[PDB]
Motif scaffolding. Structure first.
Motif, PDB file in Angstrom:
ATOM      1  N   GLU B 197       0.834  -1.190   0.000  1.00 36.95           N
ATOM      2  CA  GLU B 197       0.000   0.000   0.000  1.00 36.95           C
ATOM      3  C   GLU B 197       0.874   1.248   0.000  1.00 36.95           C
ATOM      4  OE1 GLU B 197      -3.272   0.437   2.645  1.00 36.95           O
ATOM      5  OE2 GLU B 197      -3.983  -1.627   2.413  1.00 36.95           O
ATOM      6  N   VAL B 240     -11.606   2.672   8.754  1.00 36.04           N
ATOM      7  CA  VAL B 240     -11.293   2.706   7.328  1.00 36.04           C
ATOM      8  C   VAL B 240     -12.594   2.813   6.546  1.00 36.04           C
ATOM      9  CG1 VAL B 240      -9.890   1.726   5.505  1.00 36.04           C
ATOM     10  CG2 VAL B 240      -9.434   1.071   7.867  1.00 36.04           C
ATOM     11  N   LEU B 242     -14.082   2.713   2.776  1.00 34.74           N
ATOM     12  CA  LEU B 242     -13.759   2.356   1.404  1.00 34.74           C
ATOM     13  C   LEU B 242     -14.352   3.391   0.457  1.00 34.74           C
ATOM     14  CD1 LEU B 242     -12.576   0.225  -0.605  1.00 34.74           C
ATOM     15  CD2 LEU B 242     -14.896  -0.719  -0.706  1.00 34.74           C
ATOM     16  N   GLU B 256     -10.148   1.815  -6.389  1.00 39.69           N
ATOM     17  CA  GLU B 256     -10.639   1.918  -5.026  1.00 39.69           C
ATOM     18  C   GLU B 256      -9.485   2.266  -4.096  1.00 39.69           C
ATOM     19  OE1 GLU B 256     -12.331  -1.704  -3.649  1.00 39.69           O
ATOM     20  OE2 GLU B 256     -10.545  -2.926  -4.041  1.00 39.69           O
ATOM     21  N   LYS B 258      -8.464   3.160   0.401  1.00 37.97           N
ATOM     22  CA  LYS B 258      -8.797   3.228   1.818  1.00 37.97           C
ATOM     23  C   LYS B 258      -8.710   4.679   2.269  1.00 37.97           C
ATOM     24  CE  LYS B 258      -7.267  -1.318   3.547  1.00 37.97           C
ATOM     25  NZ  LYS B 258      -6.122  -2.008   4.198  1.00 37.97           N
ATOM     26  N   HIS B 260      -8.676   6.569   5.531  1.00 37.29           N
ATOM     27  CA  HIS B 260      -8.521   6.283   6.947  1.00 37.29           C
ATOM     28  C   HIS B 260      -9.156   7.378   7.795  1.00 37.29           C
ATOM     29  CE1 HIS B 260      -5.521   3.095   6.031  1.00 37.29           C
ATOM     30  NE2 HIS B 260      -5.294   3.875   4.990  1.00 37.29           N
ATOM     31  N   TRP B 288     -18.207   1.407   4.905  1.00 35.78           N
ATOM     32  CA  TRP B 288     -17.227   1.288   5.974  1.00 35.78           C
ATOM     33  C   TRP B 288     -16.636  -0.117   5.966  1.00 35.78           C
ATOM     34  CZ3 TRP B 288     -15.416   5.498   8.241  1.00 35.78           C
ATOM     35  CH2 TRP B 288     -16.221   6.647   8.280  1.00 35.78           C
ATOM     36  N   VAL B 289     -15.309  -0.184   6.007  1.00 30.37           N
ATOM     37  CA  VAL B 289     -14.516  -1.404   5.936  1.00 30.37           C
ATOM     38  C   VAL B 289     -13.536  -1.390   7.103  1.00 30.37           C
ATOM     39  CG1 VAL B 289     -14.811  -1.703   3.450  1.00 30.37           C
ATOM     40  CG2 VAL B 289     -12.804  -0.458   4.325  1.00 30.37           C
ATOM     41  N   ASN B 290     -12.676  -2.400   7.162  1.00 33.56           N
ATOM     42  CA  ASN B 290     -11.668  -2.434   8.208  1.00 33.56           C
ATOM     43  C   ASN B 290     -10.292  -2.595   7.574  1.00 33.56           C
ATOM     44  OD1 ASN B 290     -11.333  -5.253   7.624  1.00 33.56           O
ATOM     45  ND2 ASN B 290     -13.062  -5.709   8.983  1.00 33.56           N
ATOM     46  N   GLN B 291      -9.272  -2.697   8.430  1.00 37.74           N
ATOM     47  CA  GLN B 291      -7.887  -2.732   7.969  1.00 37.74           C
ATOM     48  C   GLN B 291      -7.583  -3.945   7.103  1.00 37.74           C
ATOM     49  OE1 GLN B 291      -6.461  -3.965  12.434  1.00 37.74           O
ATOM     50  NE2 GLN B 291      -4.865  -3.892  10.858  1.00 37.74           N
ATOM     51  N   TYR B 293      -9.370  -5.184   4.658  1.00 34.16           N
ATOM     52  CA  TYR B 293      -9.857  -5.108   3.287  1.00 34.16           C
ATOM     53  C   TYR B 293      -8.679  -5.091   2.322  1.00 34.16           C
ATOM     54  CZ  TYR B 293     -12.855  -3.748  -0.623  1.00 34.16           C
ATOM     55  OH  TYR B 293     -13.539  -3.715  -1.815  1.00 34.16           O
ATOM     56  N   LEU B 295      -7.342  -4.091  -1.088  1.00 37.37           N
ATOM     57  CA  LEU B 295      -7.599  -3.206  -2.215  1.00 37.37           C
ATOM     58  C   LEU B 295      -7.118  -3.826  -3.521  1.00 37.37           C
ATOM     59  CD1 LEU B 295      -6.327   0.095  -0.558  1.00 37.37           C
ATOM     60  CD2 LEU B 295      -8.724  -0.433  -1.042  1.00 37.37           C
TER      61      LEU B 295
END
Lengths: 301, 298
Positions: B197, B240, B242, B256, B258, B260, B288-291, B293, B295
Motif C-alpha cells: 500500500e 477505514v 472504502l 478503489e 482506503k 482512513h 465502511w470497511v476495516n484494515q 480489506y 484493495l
C-alpha cells in the motif's frame, strides 16, 4: 432534497470575486445600487453563471503562453483555461472562466516553468500588473496584456498570473470590462441584480485586499462566498420559490440576529436600517428558514 | 448521519497545504514513505489538527505587524485577525508554512497609525523556514526583501506564491520555535499500514522564482474535504472508509482506496506509470470497511 447553507462563520469564508478571506458584511450606506459581477455567480439550485469557476485560489488568475512582441515591458498572454484545458472563444461565457470582472489595475506575480527550448524546467517569476481597461484586455478573444518592470520572461513558455491586489488607485468594482475589446459588446453575462423594493439593500460579503501603493481602500464585494458557490453547485437542491428566507443565527444559543432574502438568482437583500456597520456574533452564520415570495416584508436588520 | 465526500473533480479541488489548485493524483513510484504535514489535517469526523485552518487562500500566509536583503521582523497575529496566543495547543499559528524551504511571495501593508494612515505598499519577499528566526510558534517570522520600502509598526501581510529557491523538503517539518524547544501538538505522522500500500496524494505544481525546482506540494486531502468534514462532523463508523474513484457518466469504478479515519488515503501499489483518471471523475464513499480489506491494485 432540502436546500441548505454552509455553516462556516464569517472568518471561515472566502471571497468569490478575489482570492481573499471575507472581512465583514456590508450594505451601501448611501443608496441602493445595481451590480453585475461575473465571478461569484451561482443560482441557489447550482447553476454557475458569468465567468464563475469553482477553485477559490484561481479567481482573477490567468494561465497561458507568453507571446513576444512585434520602463514597462508588455507581456501578451495567449490564454488557456485555468484548469489547463484549451480556451474556446465560442463557449457561451463572457470570457475565460475566472477572468477579472471589473475595471482597474490588478497587480500580482507572473511565473513561468519552461516546457520547450534549451532550458526545459527553468523557472522565473516577477511582479506584473494587468489593466483591465487596456484595449488589449481581451479575455473573451483569448488574450490579456500584462506589464512588468522586468523583461526577464521567456518567449513561448507557459505563464501563470496570480493576483495580489491593487496595482493603482483606479478600481471600479461594479464597472464591467470590455471582455472583447473596444469594438465588440459583452455577451453571455450573468444578469444584473438589484433590490426589487425601496427600503431593501443588497447584502455583500466584503474583503479588503492589499495595494501596491497609494491610498486605495481595496474593497471587493461578492454576492455569495465561494464556499456557497461550491455548496450550491454540488447540492443542486431544487428552489421551491424565487426567494428563500434566511436568518443570521447564533448556533450556540439559537438567537436570530436578523433576517434576509436569499434570491434564487444567488444574492441577498436586507431591509435598510440605515446607519453604521453590521455587528454579528463571530460564531454565527446564515441558516435557511423557509421558501417565501417577493411580497415578504423584511424587518430592518 | 451518513458520511459523504464532495463531488468536485480533480480540477475543481484546492490544495490544503498551499494556495493552489490540484494538478494530479500522485503516489511514490519507488517506496512507501512516512509524512507528517501540519496543514490539511482533518479527521473524517471533522476534527482539525496541526496548524490547519479553513480558508483555502490563507494557507502558508502570515499576518501581523512589522517591528523592525533587508530583514523584516513580523510579530504575528492569527490570519482571521484575532491575536495569536503562543500557549495555544497548536504547533504554530494556524496556516503557518509546514515544511523546510524558501517560500517567496508578496508582503503588503496598509497603514493604520502615524502621519500616513491608509497609505499602502507591497513588494516581493521570501521566508526561509529553516532560518533561526522562523519561529511562528513563538509568534514571529523573519522575511527578507530587496526593497526597503516598508513602514515599521504597521499591519503587514505575507501572501505566498511559490519557490524562492530550489531548497524545498516538503516532508521535513520546520522548527516552529527555533533551534530550541522541539515541536509540540503535532498532527500525527501517517504511513501505509501494510506492504504493497502507498499513500495517495493530491499533488499541486506551484510556481518558482528561479532555478529548476519541481514545485511539488502534496496534501493528504484537499481543502474542500477539510471544510466538508469540519461541517458535516459525521461519526466514523470504523477506522477505514472504502472509497472509489468513479466516472459519473458510466458509473464505472476506476480504482478503489482506503480513506482512513485520521484523514488520509492509501491505495494498493500497482508499480508503474502515473495515474490516468477521467477529468469528470471524483471519489465517492462506498462503505465502511476495516484494515483487512484487500484493495485491488490501483
Amino acid at each position: 432534497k432540502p436546500f441548505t447553507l454552509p455553516i462556516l462563520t464569517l472568518g471561515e469564508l472566502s471571497n468569490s470575486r478575489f482570492p481573499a478571506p471575507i472581512d465583514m458584511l456590508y450594505t451601501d450606506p448611501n443608496e441602493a445600487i445595481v451590480v453585475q459581477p461575473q465571478n461569484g455567480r451561482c443560482t441557489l439550485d447550482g447553476t454557475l453563471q458569468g465567468t464563475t469557476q469553482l477553485v477559490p485560489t484561481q479567481i482573477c488568475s490567468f494561465r497561458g503562453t507568453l507571446i513576444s512582441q512585434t520602463r514597462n515591458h508588455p507581456l501578451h498572454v495567449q490564454l488557456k483555461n485555468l484548469d489547463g484545458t484549451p480556451y474556446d472563444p465560442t463557449d457561451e461565457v463572457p470570457a475565460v472562466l475566472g477572468a477579472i470582472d471589473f475595471k482597474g489595475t490588478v497587480f500580482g506575480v507572473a511565473s513561468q516553468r519552461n516546457t520547450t527550448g534549451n532550458s526545459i524546467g527553468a523557472t522565473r517569476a516577477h511582479e506584473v500588473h494587468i489593466d483591465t481597461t487596456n484595449p488589449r484586455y481581451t479575455p473573451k478573444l483569448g488574450s490579456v496584456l500584462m506589464y512588468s518592470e522586468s523583461n526577464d520572461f521567456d518567449d513561448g513558455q507557459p505563464t501563470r498570473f496570480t493576483p495580489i491586489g491593487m496595482g493603482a488607485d483606479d478600481w471600479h468594482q461594479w464597472e464591467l470590462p470590455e471582455y472583447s475589446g473596444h469594438l465588440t459588446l459583452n455577451m453571455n453575462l450573468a444578469p444584473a441584480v438589484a433590490p426589487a423594493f425601496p427600503g431593501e439593500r443588497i447584502l455583500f460579503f466584503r474583503s479588503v485586499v492589499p495595494s501596491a501603493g497609494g491610498y486605495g481602500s481595496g474593497h471587493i464585494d461578492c454576492l455569495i462566498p465561494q464556499e456557497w458557490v461550491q455548496h450550491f453547485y454540488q447540492e443542486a437542491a431544487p428552489s421551491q420559490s424565487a426567494v428563500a428566507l434566511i436568518r443570521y443565527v447564533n448556533p450556540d444559543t439559537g438567537r436570530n440576529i436578523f433576517e434576509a432574502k436569499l434570491h434564487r438568482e444567488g444574492f441577498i437583500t436586507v431591509a435598510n436600517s440605515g446607519n453604521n456597520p453590521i455587528v454579528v456574533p463571530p460564531n454565527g452564520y446564515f441558516r435557511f428558514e423557509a421558501w417565501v415570495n417577493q411580497f415578504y416584508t423584511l424587518t430592518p436588520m
